[PDB]
Amino acid sequence: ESKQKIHVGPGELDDYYGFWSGGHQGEVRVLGVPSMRELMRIPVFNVDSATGWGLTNESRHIMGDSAKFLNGDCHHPHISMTDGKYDGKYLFINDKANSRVARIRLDIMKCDKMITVPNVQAIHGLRLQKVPHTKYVFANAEFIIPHPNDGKVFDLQDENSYTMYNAIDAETMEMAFQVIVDGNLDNTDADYTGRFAAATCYNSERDWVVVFDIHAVEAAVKAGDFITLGDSKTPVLDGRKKDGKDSKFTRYVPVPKNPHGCNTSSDGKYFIAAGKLSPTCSMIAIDKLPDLFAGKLADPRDVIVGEPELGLGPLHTTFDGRGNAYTTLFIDSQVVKWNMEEAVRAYKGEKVNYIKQKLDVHYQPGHLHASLCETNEADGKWLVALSKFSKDRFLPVGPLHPENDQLIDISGDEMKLVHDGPTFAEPADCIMARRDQIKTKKIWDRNDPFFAPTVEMAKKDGINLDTDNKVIRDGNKVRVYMTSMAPAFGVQEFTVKQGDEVTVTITNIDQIEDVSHGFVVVNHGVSMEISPQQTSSITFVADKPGLHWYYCSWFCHALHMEMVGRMMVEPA
Template structure:
């Protein structure tokens, strides 16, 4: 059955008119009958359906639970866009396989132990004035107390920090209104140091804590040195929220186990769940982080635990920075209203939601009117005197999300499996809707910010039971979309989530997200800086220093350069990979057989992989991302040979099997190849001599290297000729192959000498031309264009002679290529090369500089 209430199969005139214009009423009615759909079902589908190419209004970031990742999906379509690797390797993006992301994961090691999984729970955006800013996202790891920063300029994890004193946590990550701090509260009380302490020392040594991670917005990183913690009693702290508006500077963290019960089911004692829920109330912690950040500036106000600053309970109390308020037993949510005046708390074992009034709280604190103190000396405020009121909502109220309408809030009811809409100012319920089943967190669009939008609600259901096709005993979670724009809430979509237990979500208007579509050429995506391994076209090379081999490679449709990498067994190999593409979505991947390395290299990005070549053999590598029609051809080979072994040539073995006529044919073939190669060498030599290469020291050195290789040919050639005269054609062929090897090395060095000499002879580059060349290279233009020859795109030599008012034409084309796509010339180029010039989003100055560089090329065209 559908989750929607069925109505008799009668279409209203309005719906029929609207639909029939597209499908014809009879066709729509037929589909509805065949699929047993009601009018309400069709309306729900219309509210969520996004035609091809239409984008969602909101983007949702969901914790991935035990996957250790984050999921990203759209509303209202509920289409999943991406997984973001955070605490766990994610192969598609190479997260945990390339060196840069390995460094991020390694920073999450705890006491030297590598942790390869996480339990992500509460995502939160950076904020300004309590409003969401789509620059960075924070997420906590409940299982291993850690906090991560995700850079929303590229949706990649850029930092993981380990909490130095907590042994578990749940209350992260909650953000102060201007992202001054990210709040992380512990869960299960434990000693703050790393030593052994028996459970009978619970009240004396075991503690809770709340950590205030200082966020450096300019750097996009948590500053661990400026972060600190507040010691709390061994009540099990849970969720938190930061005050805003009139409660700015304060924060609130709830708890359970005010009993400080320590269990012992194995000893015949009642289990934790019984002893921890005996009291009628637990405690909400109320603390002033603005006072605390001032206190931590003075060493006398904190102690150092595991190289981390911790403000003791006694110091916080003495400075009026920490208080307790009773709250219903076993609470699981604390939420500050958009204006900052009220704090909402729901108790899992209660039917009420409690609304606390911050004005009353502040008044009691100012008057020092307390109901008493807890065993640790923390002042306790009277619960009744702090309450605005309570509302009976149903069984198991947990979490809250707000509407744009003043005073309206939505609360999840875990036991009743409902979302209830109510008025927290006038203390009355307004509506409720059933969900499927056992809802935990919920969200409305930007519903936890200072300016909630409302519009839709998301119910995060723990169970799905009968909602989807069975897939075994482990069922998916169920995220349900609810339309909250009308007087009655309407459930309009079920979405199974097959990845961990997505614990909480946060939503933002898509217009607030401004991710880059490509990287600046050579970017290390985890630091945002230029990679030390950035490699532009023409800079590809292999460098060896002892047993360390470094490969500088590039990727562009449809080849990896170099295509052959030869190393010795035992070498330490690092391969830097730069994607030269500037067209968005032209990602390339890189993987090598056996060595468990993978990298995802988006346009402009440089990534690297490192490994020890400890296995002899031949190992293909290839692009893992289907990027072009010739994707399968985008590959190469790595050869690992044992330097202590003598290898017998398979080519020699093959030659031995050939007949005499076949050997003669093979001999003539290699002679012809060598002649063609030597012709190239002689043309280069002629050019070098004519241009007096000896006047240029760097060129002269390259020429000497080339001549050294070429000088070895005569001796080998003589051996080949002698073998041929003796009738040993097989031997002659092998020696001629050796001649070819020397020729290839000579040609390689010689061509580099020619290129260097050409540049030296060319008209000196003015500063603007040099800037133009830099913009040309970093813009990745050379990924498709090769000066002096046709490649994946046309030769740019003479491009300024091909069009009327050429400089303006080229400027306009680079600025916005799409404006020229329909011109006959450009159409012909697109059809020939099967590529379209992408918009590289260059500045006007960069384009002007490139035009000056193109002029310089034309001036020196005769040197090629």
């Protein structure tokens, strides 16, 4: 019987972390499960006024040249794994708008690395290698473009127009390799060995899921059998068909129809491709892929071992670890629970009903996610279905509507809907982790790589950031270094010339957890947060003569209103 408690009362704690995509708003959100309350927002592709992400020197360093963009469009959050289990080190997420992948460090809950994927447009599908650990982040570029894209050729049917499958080194956040494919890439997942990955493709009665022999790709890179594109040193391999001949790197498995979701069962047996236009899912037996690539099978369709008929508009699939799959039906507006091995037997002709239950959801579900579903520890406790049209499920709030993320108890034989959670800007997908899988820092380490370049800059100025309160003058450049301890800035006044470029570096030397300080320069567009033992810095030009106040934004003390300072700007 499904009967878990969903109420988390005052003083009680949630059981799981939920990491929500921020959708078209560009951030990552940390929720508590089952309360579904948002505990934290992690800025990634958005500019965050509160913490200064996008404004501070540390954040703009991480974003690189892409710091010039104020937008992102993220969909697919995933947590790094060791031996097919979450290891709590990193979260990765895509940006479809400006073609990026970001890495979030789960000990500090901040984006610490970001890469613009070269020579592609629109990073959409994204998932992680599971075994032996997350060595690679796999990322789909959705849209076919010319190569080179220099304006001579616009023809998408040209022999050099294509998109590519992308592998990023998870630990260094540099590109590992790219594989040219036929068609457009949609979603992707990986197996439980490290040898294989797979992606649904459209555009090309039948499209396909393309399967990658990552071992074969790696071997070619080690031997130097690759090309490069443009000014990127990324190894590029050709996984397209040539005159009907297969690459060593890819096999194309025909699947109906404009397939969408591409999900690996937690027992490692199947890549399950959701049918979308076809009221089916297609089940690819991962154990038959070695024979496929070895040329031992008569037809790529022979790796298909199941094609259950589920209902109208299957989009995504998740797993309870008990042998059931759960699939969103976008048109029927349902989650369907079905037994995978019974579907496999049905495909062989046995009369057996693999469908267990259909639960109405509200309305038009897209992604769905069961707790630990991407790991061999899938625990079958909670399911979230992320529905696009909330209609009358919440109070009206004008022409824009919230997404409806519905929490469903799957611990028993029958799915039970227990909570409707409204969300902003269409998160699309989420991922859950056990409380004990996530370990966070209470206070920053003074050696943290997040602000190590700022420590380096201070070193060149002869500054001990833990103690110093000093103003360095360097032509028209002014570098203010200060400590802060509630309720006082360590430098409470400084004077500059109009036009000077001012950098303010603040080190919070409070040692009590949770005592954040802020720094805002009034009417200059300057804002940032500094947590205990963090160093943060921000650069702006003092283009206005006169007295200009700065203040601590984050309530830190009974005397917070009075934690202020003055920048005095002498006229030109």
